[PDB]
Design a protein around this ligand. Sequence first.
Ligand SMILES: O=C(O)c1ccc(Nc2nc(-c3ccc4ccccc4c3)cs2)cc1O
Length: 326
Amino acid sequence: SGPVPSRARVYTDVNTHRPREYWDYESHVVEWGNQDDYQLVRKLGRGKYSEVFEAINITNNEKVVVKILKPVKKKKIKREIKILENLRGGPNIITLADIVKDPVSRTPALVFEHVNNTDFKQLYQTLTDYDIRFYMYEILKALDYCHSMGIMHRDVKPHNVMIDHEHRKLRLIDWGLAEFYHPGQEYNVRVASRYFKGPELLVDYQMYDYSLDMWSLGCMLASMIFRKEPFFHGHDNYDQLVRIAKVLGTEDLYDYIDKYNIELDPRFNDILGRHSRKRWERFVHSENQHLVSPEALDFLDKLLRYDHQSRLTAREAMEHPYFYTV
Ligand SMILES: O=C(O)c1ccc(Nc2nc(-c3ccc4ccccc4c3)cs2)cc1O
């Protein structure tokens, strides 16, 4: 009778033991400064929810990034702002430098520290075994910090990991999908990019936590060590679960939906099939073997698991032998 409840294994009550001001973003008062202090230089790109520009602060001659938001949902803008302010200054967390509105357009805009990004497709070729271990540890610094702050990112993926390889600097960006973790809260499963979506989202299990970001990090590690981007290549949300099942096997999937008494969607009936549990060593090839190690495979195996409770937390992950060299 209904799905079995679940709670995070770490930082369970960090928001409960904090006054409402911290996590009640709908009550947070945003002060929008004047955009006249920033001169737009070039368009960095377009996206869902936003337009990103390189700009110059007229008050100190420093380069910044200006993200002009399509004001689609007021609560969502308040959430992103509140989270950014809460995390401001945290290790490898993008720094929200300002919050501005152009006088004539009144369009919500966020101002961020400029990061001289190295495109993931160009970095992909020049990354060493050490580089992967180093950058994974840096994202873990970001994750353990934001999780300790009662925040789950919910959109961990390569585009949201800005790397200035020359200066060996990493920043976890786009907190537009982030949420405050409250034990027993039922969340929207329509979060993360398809390839990085956790089995919990795909099976419509709403009581998820920080462990969702641990799945995504696994998907990113699996694509890096094996040189296979994306590792799980779903063509839709239902097919995404089939791609996971093709690696993790259907036995452990049914074990997961049974441990939590999840009602599997009828759209999964004709596509899921039957799949054996694959060994991680099957993904080792001539092109990637110099990035793979027993330690890397042991760490990967501990992240990519159906059961969100069974996945390593960011802190446990930081103690894994895969990071002894960093
Ligand atoms: O949301 C955030 O917190 C956030 C923080 C910093 C930041 N910095 C930067 N972005 C880019 C960039 C480059 C190529 C692109 C292609 C399509 C679309 C967008 C794109 C953005 C370069 S440096 C961007 C952000 O979106």
